[PDB]
From a paper:
The ubiquitin E3 ligase cereblon ([name]) is the target of therapeutic drugs thalidomide and lenalidomide and is recruited by most targeted protein degraders (PROTACs and molecular glues) in clinical development. [name] consists of an unstructured N-terminal region and three folded domains: the Lon protease-like domain (Lon), the helical bundle (HB) which facilitates binding to the adaptor protein DDB1, and the thalidomide binding domain (TBD). We present the design of CRBNmidi, a construct that readily expresses from E. coli with high yields as soluble, stable protein without DDB1. Importantly, the stabilizing mutations introduced based on PROSS analysis proved to have beneficial effects, with the best-expressing construct (construct 8, hereafter referred to as CRBNmidi) incorporating 12 mutations.
Next, we successfully crystallized CRBNmidi protein and determined its crystal structure to a resolution of 3.11 Å. As with [name]ΔN:DDB1, the structure shows CRBNmidi co-purified with a Zn2+ ion bound to the zinc finger of the TBD. Interestingly, the protein in the structure is observed to adopt the closed conformation, despite the absence of a small-molecule ligand. The compact closed conformation was likely selected for by the crystallization process as, unlike for ligand-bound CRBNmidi which produces large numbers of hits, we only obtained a single crystal for apo CRBNmidi indicating that apo CRBNmidi is recalcitrant to crystallization in its flexible open conformation. In addition, as CRBNmidi is purified in the absence of DDB1, the additional stabilisation of the open confirmation through interactions between the sensor loop (residues 341–361) and DDB1(residues ~776–780) that was previously observed by Watson et al. cannot take place in this structure, and is likely a contributing factor to observing the closed state.
Numbering used by the authors: 72 to 187, 250 to 268, 271 to 317, 319 to 352, 354 to 425
Write the structure that this text describes.
């Protein structure tokens, strides 16, 4: 692993506008010949690329980000194209010192690794159990716990970065608890439609609270909630490439503005425990 305060050059996939956190999984599917070639060499060259926390995506302005290390690589060939699907985990946060694009179009970023309250954890843990009671997979260390919380939380991207700037685990834990106290989400374009609340979130899996899935190119972050409001389902369930196995999906849509706020999931077998659960896209929701 890269040393603290070091300065190295790490590739930037120009498509990603997600804000990754150390320990946050990123699913990627690459169709472009260049991006594919970059990952292949990178697979031999430490499998480490850069995920920037863009402030203004239009200008592509990010002051910091986190490193992502590839752990899965599978190659396919569809419609005459060579495609690559890779999975990578956040490893180390960094601060952007420089970023210039080489002649080949390969965007590289030179960055500096940023160096690495028990009752505050537990009190924060009690606040999470109030919204949903579950069985632990939650981490023991305070460092890891601050990151998992930052990833699995309905956070605005503005505040998502603000917790990456914090270099103290105890400070991350303290700032994160203040937000959980600060209640419900809403439709972005509307800003009036109230969709769900913190009491509805739950975890189908260990990383259940929030996780990411690829567009069968686009990468969505989907919040799992038990019930929802003010959203119309459209059509009938389909079992095609259900992001959650054994469930069928139907597109949800805002009643007022018709923005696609997510999907509604339904068990193909009565045996499954969360019979009714909703997947909601983070990009379509703004916290109140
Ligand atoms: Zn709306």
């Amino acid at each position: 692993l890269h040393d603290d305060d070091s300065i190295q050059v790490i590739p930037v996939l120009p498509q990603v506008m997600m804000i990754l956190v150390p320990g946050q999984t990123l699913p990627l599917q690459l169709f472009h010949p260049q991006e594919v070639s970059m990952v292949r060499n990178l697979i031999q060259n430490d499998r480490t690329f850069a995920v920037l926390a863009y402030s203004n995506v239009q200008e592509r302005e990010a002051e910091f980000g986190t490193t992502a290390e590839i752990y899965a690589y599978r190659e396919e060939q569809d419609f005459g194209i060579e495609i690559v699907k890779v999975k990578a985990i956040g490893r180390q946060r960094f601060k952007v010192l420089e970023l210039r694009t080489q002649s080949d179009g390969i965007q590289q970023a030179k960055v500096q690794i940023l160096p690495e309250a028990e009752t505050l954890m537990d009190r924060i843990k009690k606040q999470l159990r109030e919204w949903d009671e579950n069985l632990d997979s939650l981490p023991s260390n305070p460092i890891d716990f601050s990151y998992w919380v930052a990833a699995n939380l309905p956070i605005d991207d503005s505040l998502r970065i603000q917790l990456l700037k914090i270099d103290s685990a105890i400070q991350r834990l303290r700032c994160e608890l203040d937000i959980m106290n600060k209640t419900s989400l809403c439709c972005k374009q509307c800003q009036e439609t109230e969709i769900t609340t913190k009491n509805e979130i739950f975890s189908l899996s260990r990383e259940g609270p929030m996780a990411a899935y690829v567009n069968p190119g686009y990468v969505h972050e989907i919040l799992t909630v038990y019930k929802a409001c003010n959203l119309n389902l459209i059509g009938r369930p389909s079992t095609e490439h259900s992001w959650f196995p054994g469930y069928a999906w139907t597109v949800a849509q805002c009643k007022i503005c018709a923005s696609h706020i997510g999907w509604k999931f339904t068990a193909t077998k009565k045996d499954m425990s969360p019979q009714k659960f909703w997947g909601l896209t983070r990009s379509a929701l703004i916290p109140t």
